[PDB]
C-alpha atoms as a printed R data frame, in Angstrom:
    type eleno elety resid chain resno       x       y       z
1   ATOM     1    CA   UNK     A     1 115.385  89.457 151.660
2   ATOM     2    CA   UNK     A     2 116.119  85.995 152.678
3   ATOM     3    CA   UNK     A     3 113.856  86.246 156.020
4   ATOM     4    CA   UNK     A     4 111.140  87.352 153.519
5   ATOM     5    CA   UNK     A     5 111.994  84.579 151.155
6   ATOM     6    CA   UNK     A     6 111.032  81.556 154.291
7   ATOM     7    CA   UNK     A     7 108.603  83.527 155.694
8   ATOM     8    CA   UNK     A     8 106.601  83.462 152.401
9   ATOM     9    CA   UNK     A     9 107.469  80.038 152.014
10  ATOM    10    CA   UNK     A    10 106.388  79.079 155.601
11  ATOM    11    CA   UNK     A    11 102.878  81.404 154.652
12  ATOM    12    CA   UNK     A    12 102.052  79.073 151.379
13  ATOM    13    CA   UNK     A    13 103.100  76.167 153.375
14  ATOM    14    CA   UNK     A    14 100.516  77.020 155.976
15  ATOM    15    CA   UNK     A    15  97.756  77.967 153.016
16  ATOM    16    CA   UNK     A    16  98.159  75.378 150.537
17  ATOM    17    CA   UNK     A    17  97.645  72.884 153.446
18  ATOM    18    CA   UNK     A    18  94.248  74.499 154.175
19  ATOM    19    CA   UNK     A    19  93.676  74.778 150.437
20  ATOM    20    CA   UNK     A    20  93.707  71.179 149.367
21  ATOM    21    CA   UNK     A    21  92.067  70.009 152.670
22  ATOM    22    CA   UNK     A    22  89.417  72.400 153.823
23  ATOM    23    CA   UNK     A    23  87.686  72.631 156.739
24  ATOM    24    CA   UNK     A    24  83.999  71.870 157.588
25  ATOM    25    CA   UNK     A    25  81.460  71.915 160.169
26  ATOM    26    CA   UNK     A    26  83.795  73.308 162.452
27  ATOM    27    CA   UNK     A    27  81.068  73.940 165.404
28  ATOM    28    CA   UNK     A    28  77.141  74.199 165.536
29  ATOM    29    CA   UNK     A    29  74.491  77.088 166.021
30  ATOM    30    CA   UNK     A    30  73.785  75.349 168.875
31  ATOM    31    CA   UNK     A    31  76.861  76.309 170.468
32  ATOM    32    CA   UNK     A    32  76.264  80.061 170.098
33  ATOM    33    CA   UNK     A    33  74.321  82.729 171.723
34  ATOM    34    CA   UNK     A    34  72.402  84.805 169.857
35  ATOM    35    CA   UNK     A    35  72.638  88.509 170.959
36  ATOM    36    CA   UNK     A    36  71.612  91.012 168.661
37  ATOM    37    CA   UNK     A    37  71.281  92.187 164.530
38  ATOM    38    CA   UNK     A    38  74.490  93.596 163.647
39  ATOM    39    CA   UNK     A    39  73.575  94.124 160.015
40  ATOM    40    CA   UNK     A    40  72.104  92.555 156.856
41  ATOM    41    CA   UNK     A    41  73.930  90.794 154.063
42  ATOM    42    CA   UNK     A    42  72.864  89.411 150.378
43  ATOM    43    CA   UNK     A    43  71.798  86.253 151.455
44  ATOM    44    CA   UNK     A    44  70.563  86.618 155.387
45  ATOM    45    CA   UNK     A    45  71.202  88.427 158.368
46  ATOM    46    CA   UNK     A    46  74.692  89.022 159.983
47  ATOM    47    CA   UNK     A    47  74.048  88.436 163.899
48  ATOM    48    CA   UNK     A    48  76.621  89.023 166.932
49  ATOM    49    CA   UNK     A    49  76.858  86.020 169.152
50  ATOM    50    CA   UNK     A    50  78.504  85.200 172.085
51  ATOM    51    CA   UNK     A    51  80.437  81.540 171.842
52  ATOM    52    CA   UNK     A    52  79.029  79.360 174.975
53  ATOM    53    CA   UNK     A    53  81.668  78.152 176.448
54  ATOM    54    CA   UNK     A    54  84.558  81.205 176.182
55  ATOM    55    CA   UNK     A    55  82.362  84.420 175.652
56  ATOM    56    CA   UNK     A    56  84.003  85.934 173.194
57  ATOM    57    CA   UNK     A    57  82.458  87.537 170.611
58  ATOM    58    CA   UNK     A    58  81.596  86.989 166.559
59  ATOM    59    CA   UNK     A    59  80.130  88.502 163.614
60  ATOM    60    CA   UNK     A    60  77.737  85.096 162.319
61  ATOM    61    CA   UNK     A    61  77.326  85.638 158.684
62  ATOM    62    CA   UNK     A    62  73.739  83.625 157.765
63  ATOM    63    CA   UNK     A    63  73.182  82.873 154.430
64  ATOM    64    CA   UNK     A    64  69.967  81.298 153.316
65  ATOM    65    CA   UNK     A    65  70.618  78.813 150.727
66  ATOM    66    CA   UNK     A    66  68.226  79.260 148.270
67  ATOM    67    CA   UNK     A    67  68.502  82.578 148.514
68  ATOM    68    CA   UNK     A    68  72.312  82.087 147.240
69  ATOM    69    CA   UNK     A    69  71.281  79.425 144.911
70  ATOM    70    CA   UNK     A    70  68.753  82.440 143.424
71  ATOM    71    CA   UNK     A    71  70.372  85.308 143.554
72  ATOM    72    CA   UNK     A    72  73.251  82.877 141.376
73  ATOM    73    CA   UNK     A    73  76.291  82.785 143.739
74  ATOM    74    CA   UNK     A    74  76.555  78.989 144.663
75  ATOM    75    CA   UNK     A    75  80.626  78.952 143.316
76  ATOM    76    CA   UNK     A    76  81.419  82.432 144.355
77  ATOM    77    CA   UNK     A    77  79.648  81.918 147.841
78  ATOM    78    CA   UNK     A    78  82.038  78.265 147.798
79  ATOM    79    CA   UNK     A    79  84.972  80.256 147.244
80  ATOM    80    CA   UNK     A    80  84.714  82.750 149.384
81  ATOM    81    CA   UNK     A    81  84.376  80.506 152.103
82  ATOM    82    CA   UNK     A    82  87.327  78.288 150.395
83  ATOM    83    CA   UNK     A    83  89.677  81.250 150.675
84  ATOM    84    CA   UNK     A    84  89.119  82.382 153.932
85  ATOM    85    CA   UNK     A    85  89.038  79.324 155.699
86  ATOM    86    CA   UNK     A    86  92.877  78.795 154.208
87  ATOM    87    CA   UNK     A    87  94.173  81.842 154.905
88  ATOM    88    CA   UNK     A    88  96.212  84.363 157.827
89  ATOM    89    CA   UNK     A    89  97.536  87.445 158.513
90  ATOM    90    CA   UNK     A    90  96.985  90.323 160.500
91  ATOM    91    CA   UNK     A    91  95.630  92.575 158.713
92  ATOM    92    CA   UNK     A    92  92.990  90.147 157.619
93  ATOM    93    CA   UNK     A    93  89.857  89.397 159.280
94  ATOM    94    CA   UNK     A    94  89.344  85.562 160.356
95  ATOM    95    CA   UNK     A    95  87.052  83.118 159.406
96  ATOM    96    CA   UNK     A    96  86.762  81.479 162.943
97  ATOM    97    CA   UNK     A    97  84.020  78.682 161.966
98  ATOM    98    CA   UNK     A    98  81.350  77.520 159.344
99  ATOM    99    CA   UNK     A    99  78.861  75.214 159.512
100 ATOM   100    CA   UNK     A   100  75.844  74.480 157.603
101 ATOM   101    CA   UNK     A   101  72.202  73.117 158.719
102 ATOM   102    CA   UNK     A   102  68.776  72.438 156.699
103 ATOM   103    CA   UNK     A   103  68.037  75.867 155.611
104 ATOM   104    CA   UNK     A   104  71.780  78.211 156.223
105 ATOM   105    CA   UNK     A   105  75.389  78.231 156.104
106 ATOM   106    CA   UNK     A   106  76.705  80.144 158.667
107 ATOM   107    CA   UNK     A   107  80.243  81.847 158.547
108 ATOM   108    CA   UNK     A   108  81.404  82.876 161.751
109 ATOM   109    CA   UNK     A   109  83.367  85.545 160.974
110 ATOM   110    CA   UNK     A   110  85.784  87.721 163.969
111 ATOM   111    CA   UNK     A   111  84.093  90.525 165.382
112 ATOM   112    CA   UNK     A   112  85.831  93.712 165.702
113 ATOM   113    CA   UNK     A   113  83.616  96.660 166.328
114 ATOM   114    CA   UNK     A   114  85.993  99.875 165.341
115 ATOM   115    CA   UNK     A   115  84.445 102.210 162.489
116 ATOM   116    CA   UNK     A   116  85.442 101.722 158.882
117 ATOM   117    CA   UNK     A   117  87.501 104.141 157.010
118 ATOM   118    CA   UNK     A   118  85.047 104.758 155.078
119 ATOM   119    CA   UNK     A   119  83.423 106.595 157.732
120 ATOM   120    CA   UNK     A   120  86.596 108.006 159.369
121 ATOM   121    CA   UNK     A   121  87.937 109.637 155.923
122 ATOM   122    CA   UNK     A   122  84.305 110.936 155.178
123 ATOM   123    CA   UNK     A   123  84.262 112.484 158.928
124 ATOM   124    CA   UNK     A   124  87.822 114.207 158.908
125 ATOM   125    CA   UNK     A   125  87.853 114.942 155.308
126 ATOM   126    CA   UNK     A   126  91.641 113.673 154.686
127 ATOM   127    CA   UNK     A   127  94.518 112.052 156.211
128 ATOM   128    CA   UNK     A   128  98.301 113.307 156.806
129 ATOM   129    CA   UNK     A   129 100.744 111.819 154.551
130 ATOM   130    CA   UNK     A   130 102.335 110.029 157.916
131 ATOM   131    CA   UNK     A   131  98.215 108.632 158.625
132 ATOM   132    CA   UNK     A   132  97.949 107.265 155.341
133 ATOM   133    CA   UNK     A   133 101.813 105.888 154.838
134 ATOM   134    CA   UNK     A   134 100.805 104.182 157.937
135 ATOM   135    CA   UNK     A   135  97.610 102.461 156.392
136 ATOM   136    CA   UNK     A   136  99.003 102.066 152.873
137 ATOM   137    CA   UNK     A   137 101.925  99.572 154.395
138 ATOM   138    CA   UNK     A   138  99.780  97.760 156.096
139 ATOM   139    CA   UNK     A   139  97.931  97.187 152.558
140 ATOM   140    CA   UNK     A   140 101.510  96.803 151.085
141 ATOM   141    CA   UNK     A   141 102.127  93.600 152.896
142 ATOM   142    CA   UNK     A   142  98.583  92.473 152.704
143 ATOM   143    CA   UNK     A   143  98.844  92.223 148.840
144 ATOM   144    CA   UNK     A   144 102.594  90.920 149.540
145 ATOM   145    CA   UNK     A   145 101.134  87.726 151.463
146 ATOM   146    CA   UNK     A   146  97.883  87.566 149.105
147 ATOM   147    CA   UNK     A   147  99.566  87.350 145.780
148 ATOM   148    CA   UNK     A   148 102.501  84.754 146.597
149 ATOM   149    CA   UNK     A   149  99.537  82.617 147.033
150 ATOM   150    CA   UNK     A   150  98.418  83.798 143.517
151 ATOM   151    CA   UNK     A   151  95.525  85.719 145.051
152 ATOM   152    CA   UNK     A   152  93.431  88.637 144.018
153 ATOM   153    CA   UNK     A   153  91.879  90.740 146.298
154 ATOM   154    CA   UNK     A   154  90.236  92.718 143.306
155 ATOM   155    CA   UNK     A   155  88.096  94.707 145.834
156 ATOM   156    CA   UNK     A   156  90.045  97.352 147.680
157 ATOM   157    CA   UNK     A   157  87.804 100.368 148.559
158 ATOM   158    CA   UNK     A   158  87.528 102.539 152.014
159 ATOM   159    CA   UNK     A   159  84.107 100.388 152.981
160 ATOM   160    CA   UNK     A   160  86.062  97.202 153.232
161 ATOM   161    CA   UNK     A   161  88.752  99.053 155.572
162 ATOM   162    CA   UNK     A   162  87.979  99.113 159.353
163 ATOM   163    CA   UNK     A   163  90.180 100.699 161.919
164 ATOM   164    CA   UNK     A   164  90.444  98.377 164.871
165 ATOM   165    CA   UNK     A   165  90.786  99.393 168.725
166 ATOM   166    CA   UNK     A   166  94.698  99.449 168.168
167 ATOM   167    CA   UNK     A   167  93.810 101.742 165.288
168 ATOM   168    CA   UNK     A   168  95.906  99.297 163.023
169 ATOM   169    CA   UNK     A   169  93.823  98.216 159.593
170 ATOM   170    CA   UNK     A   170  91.940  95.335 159.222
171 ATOM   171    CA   UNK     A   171  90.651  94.016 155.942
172 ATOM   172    CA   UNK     A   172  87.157  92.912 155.865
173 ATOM   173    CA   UNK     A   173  85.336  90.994 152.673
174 ATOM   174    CA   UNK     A   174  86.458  88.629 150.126
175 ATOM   175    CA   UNK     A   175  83.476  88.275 148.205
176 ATOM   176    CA   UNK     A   176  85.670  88.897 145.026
177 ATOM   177    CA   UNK     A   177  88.808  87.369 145.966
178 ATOM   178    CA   UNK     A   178  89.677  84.658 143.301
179 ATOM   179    CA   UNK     A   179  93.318  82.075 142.959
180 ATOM   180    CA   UNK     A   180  94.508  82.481 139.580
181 ATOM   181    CA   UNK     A   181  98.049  81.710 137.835
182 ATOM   182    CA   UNK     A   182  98.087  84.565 134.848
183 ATOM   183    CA   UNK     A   183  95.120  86.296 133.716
184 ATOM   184    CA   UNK     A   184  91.146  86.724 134.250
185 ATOM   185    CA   UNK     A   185  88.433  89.068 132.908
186 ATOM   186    CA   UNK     A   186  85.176  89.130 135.269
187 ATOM   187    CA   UNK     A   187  83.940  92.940 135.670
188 ATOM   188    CA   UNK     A   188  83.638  93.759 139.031
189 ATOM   189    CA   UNK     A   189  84.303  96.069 142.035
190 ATOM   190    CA   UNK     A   190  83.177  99.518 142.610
191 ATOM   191    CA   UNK     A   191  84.337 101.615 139.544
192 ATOM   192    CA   UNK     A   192  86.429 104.390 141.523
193 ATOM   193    CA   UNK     A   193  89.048 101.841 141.968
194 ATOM   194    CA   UNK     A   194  88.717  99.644 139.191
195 ATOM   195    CA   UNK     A   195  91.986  99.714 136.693
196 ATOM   196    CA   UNK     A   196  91.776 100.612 132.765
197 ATOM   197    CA   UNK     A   197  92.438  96.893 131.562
198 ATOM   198    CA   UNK     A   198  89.640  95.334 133.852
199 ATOM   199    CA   UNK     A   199  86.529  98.496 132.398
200 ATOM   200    CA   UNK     A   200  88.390  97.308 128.829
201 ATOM   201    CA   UNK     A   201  87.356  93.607 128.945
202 ATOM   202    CA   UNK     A   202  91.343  92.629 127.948
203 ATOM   203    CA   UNK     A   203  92.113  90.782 130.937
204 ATOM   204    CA   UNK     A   204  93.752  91.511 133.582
205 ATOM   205    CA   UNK     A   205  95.848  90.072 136.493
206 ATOM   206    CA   UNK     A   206  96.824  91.013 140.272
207 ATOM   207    CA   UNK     A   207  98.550  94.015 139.318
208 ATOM   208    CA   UNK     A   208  94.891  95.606 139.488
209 ATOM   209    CA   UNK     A   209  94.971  95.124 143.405
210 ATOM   210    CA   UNK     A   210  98.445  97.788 142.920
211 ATOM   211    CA   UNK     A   211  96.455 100.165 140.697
212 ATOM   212    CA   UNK     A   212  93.548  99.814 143.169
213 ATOM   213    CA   UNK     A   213  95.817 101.093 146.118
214 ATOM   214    CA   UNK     A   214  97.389 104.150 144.075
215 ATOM   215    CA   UNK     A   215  93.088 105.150 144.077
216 ATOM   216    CA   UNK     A   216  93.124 104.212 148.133
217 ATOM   217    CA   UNK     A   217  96.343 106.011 148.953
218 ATOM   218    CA   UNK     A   218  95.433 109.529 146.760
219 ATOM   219    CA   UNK     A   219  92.145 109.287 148.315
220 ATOM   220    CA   UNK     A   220  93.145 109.056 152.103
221 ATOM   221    CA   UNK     A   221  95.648 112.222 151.656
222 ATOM   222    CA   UNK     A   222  93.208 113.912 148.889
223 ATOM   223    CA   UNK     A   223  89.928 113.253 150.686
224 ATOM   224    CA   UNK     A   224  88.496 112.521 147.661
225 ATOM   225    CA   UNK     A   225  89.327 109.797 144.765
226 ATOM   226    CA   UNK     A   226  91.607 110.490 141.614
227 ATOM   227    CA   UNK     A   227  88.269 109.623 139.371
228 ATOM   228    CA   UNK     A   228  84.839 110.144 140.016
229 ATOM   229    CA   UNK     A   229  81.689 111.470 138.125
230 ATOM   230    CA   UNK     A   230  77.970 111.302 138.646
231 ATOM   231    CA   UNK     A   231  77.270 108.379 136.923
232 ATOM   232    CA   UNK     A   232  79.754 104.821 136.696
233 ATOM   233    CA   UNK     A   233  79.700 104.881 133.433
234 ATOM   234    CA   UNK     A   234  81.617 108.948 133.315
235 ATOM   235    CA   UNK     A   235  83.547 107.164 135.911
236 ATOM   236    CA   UNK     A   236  85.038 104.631 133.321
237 ATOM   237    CA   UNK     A   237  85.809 106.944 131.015
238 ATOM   238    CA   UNK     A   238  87.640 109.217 132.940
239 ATOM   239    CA   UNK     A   239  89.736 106.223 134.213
240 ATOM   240    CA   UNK     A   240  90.576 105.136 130.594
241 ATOM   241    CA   UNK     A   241  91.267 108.751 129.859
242 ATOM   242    CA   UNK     A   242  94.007 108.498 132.544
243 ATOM   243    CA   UNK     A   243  94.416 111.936 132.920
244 ATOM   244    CA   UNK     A   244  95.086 112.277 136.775
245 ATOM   245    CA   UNK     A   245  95.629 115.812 138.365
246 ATOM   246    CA   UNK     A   246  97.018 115.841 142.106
247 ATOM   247    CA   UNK     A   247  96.286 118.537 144.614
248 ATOM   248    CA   UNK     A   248  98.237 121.630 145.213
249 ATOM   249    CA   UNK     A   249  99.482 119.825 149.015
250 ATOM   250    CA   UNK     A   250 101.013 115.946 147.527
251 ATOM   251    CA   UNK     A   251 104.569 115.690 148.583
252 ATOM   252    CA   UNK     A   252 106.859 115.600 145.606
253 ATOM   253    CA   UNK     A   253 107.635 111.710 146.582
254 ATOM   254    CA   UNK     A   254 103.918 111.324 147.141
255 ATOM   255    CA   UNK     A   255 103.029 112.601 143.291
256 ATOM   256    CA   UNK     A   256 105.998 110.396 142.003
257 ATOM   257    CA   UNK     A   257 104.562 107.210 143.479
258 ATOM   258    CA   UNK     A   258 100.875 107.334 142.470
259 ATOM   259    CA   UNK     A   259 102.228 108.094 138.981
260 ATOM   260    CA   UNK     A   260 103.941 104.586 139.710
261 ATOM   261    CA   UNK     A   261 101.017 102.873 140.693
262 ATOM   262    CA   UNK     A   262  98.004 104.518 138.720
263 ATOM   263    CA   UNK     A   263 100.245 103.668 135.497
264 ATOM   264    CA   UNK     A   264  98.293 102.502 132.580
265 ATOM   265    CA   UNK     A   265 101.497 100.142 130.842
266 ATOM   266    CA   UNK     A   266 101.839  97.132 132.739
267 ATOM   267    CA   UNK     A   267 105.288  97.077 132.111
268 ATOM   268    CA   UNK     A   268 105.815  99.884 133.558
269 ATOM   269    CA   UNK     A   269 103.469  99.508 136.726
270 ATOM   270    CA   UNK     A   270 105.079  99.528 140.392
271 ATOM   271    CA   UNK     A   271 104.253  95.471 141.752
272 ATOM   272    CA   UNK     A   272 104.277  93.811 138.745
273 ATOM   273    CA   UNK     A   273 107.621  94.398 137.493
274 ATOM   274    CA   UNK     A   274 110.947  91.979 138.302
275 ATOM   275    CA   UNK     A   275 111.304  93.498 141.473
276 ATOM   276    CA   UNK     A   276 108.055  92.925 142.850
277 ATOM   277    CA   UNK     A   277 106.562  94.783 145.885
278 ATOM   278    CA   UNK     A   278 110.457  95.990 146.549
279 ATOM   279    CA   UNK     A   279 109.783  98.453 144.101
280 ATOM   280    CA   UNK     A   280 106.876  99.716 146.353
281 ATOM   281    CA   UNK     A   281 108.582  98.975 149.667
282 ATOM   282    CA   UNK     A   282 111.985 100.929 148.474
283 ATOM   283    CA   UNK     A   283 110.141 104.127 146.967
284 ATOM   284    CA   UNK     A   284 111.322 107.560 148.483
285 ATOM   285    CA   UNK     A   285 107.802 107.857 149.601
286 ATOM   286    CA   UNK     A   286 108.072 104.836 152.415
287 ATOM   287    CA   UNK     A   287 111.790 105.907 153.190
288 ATOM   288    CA   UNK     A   288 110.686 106.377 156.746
289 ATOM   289    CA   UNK     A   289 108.797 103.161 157.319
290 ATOM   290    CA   UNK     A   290 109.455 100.386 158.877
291 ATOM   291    CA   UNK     A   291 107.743  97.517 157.302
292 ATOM   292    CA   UNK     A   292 108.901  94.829 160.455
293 ATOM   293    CA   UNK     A   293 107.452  96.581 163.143
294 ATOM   294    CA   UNK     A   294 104.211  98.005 161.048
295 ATOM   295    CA   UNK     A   295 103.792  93.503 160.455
296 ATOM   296    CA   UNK     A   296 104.687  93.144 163.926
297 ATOM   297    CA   UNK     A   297 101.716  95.588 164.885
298 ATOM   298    CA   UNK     A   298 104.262  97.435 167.278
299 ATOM   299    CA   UNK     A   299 104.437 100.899 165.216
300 ATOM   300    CA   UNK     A   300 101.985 103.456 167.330
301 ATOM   301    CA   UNK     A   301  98.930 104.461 165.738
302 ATOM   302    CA   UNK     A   302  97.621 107.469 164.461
303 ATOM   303    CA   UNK     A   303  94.507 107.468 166.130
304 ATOM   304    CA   UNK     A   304  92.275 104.931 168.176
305 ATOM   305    CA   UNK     A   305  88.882 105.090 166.986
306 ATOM   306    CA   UNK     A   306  85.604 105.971 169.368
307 ATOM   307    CA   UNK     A   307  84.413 104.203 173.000
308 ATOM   308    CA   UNK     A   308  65.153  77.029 160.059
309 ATOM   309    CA   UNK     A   309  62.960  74.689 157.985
310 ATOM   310    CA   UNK     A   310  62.658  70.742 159.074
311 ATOM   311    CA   UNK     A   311  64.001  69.764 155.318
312 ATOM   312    CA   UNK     A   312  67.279  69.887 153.855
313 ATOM   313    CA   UNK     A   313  67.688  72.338 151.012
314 ATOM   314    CA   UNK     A   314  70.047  72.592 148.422
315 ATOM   315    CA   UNK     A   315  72.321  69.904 149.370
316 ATOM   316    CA   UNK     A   316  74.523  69.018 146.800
317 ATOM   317    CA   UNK     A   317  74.625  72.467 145.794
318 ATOM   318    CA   UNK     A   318  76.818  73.046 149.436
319 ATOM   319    CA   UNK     A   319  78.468  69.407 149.803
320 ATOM   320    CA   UNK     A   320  81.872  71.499 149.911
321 ATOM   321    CA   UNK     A   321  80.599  74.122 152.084
């Protein structure tokens, strides 16, 4: 209650500060070491580097800026950047630097090599109620801290889930992220997990991030998502259609919840209602958590995954960047 109540104030403090004065050109390619590919992105390559001076490790995000400019995501690319420079919390990846030279900007993002869930739920078919309880809170809190800032996430999927070496959740891209007071209507985000009102076009508002982990949390203990079909489009319809069966194993408290979450009436869905995220947090389901020491990273895990060109381009295009 009241610890919640400054702590949340203290967070927004912390964010808005960031918000209104964001940081640039925080450090310089020339003060990394390039070690190998990690992976491609939209817009460049994603390389590991070692920092010079302290040897730790990153993941650099490169993205060539015409390549953004052309591919038409100059203001999303802004805000992406805008967002995660500004904000912290555990269970969120960091931004550690950006920069920008003649050709890139850079994003140098915190490397954690671990295995996504993605993977993990793919590779043991389905989690224990206890295993995913123990992920969903983690997500709980995450949308907790990202909507008193009037964030939404608007992406939550398994792929954007890693399990880090203390097995604890970290959450990894915030390509559709977006600040908003009230309501927006841009389609996207992988259909499994999108929400009725966003495939209707009526607008929508963060309450599709709760709908979005009622999909996450009956597809870690199902193994397999509430909707699916061959093709996206079969995908939306069965989502509109609602109709949501449960397998023969969900808990009793388990069933109850995701019909409180994957509820089509927004006045009747769990984190938008007047008690907020309390109605999540004080369900029968999450009776047994404890929602200090899961922040506090101290609950044990339940498992520990596996052992340039010469010319400047597009410059006022990334004067913010």
């Amino acid at each position: 209650s009241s610890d919640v109540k400054e702590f949340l104030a203290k967070a927004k403090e912390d964010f808005l500060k960031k918000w209104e004065s964001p940081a640039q050109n925080t450090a310089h390619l020339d003060q990394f070491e390039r070690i190998k590919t990690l992976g491609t992105g939209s817009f460049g390559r994603v390389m590991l580097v070692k920092h010079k001076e302290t040897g730790n490790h990153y993941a650099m995000k490169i993205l060539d800026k015409q390549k953004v400019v052309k591919l038409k995501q100059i203001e999303h690319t802004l805000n992406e950047k805008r967002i995660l420079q500004a904000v912290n919390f555990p269970f969120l990846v960091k931004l550690e630097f950006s920069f920008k030279d003649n050709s890139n900007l850079y994003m140098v993002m915190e490397y954690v090599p671990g295995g996504e869930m993605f993977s993990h739920l793919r590779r043991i078919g389905r989690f224990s109620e206890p295993h995913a309880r123990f992920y969903a809170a983690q997500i709980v809190l995450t949308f907790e801290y990202l909507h008193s800032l009037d964030l939404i996430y608007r992406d939550l999927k398994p792929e954007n889930l890693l399990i880090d070496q203390q097995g604890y959740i970290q959450v990894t891209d915030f390509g559709f992220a977006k600040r908003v007071k009230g309501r927006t209507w841009t389609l996207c985000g992988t259909p499994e997990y999108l929400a009725p009102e966003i495939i209707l076009s009526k607008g929508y508002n963060k309450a599709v991030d709760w709908w979005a982990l009622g999909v996450l949390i009956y597809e870690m203990a199902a193994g397999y998502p509430p909707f699916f079909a061959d093709q996206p489009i079969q995908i939306y319809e069965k989502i509109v259609s609602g109709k949501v069966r449960f397998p023969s194993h969900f808990s009793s408290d388990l069933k109850d919840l995701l019909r409180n979450l994957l509820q089509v009436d927004l006045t009747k869905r769990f984190g938008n209602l007047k008690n907020g995220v309390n109605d999540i947090k004080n369900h029968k389901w999450f009776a047994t958590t404890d929602w200090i020491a899961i922040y506090q990273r101290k609950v044990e895990a339940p498992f520990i995954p596996k052992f340039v060109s010469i010319n400047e381009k597009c410059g006022k295009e990334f004067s913010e960047f």
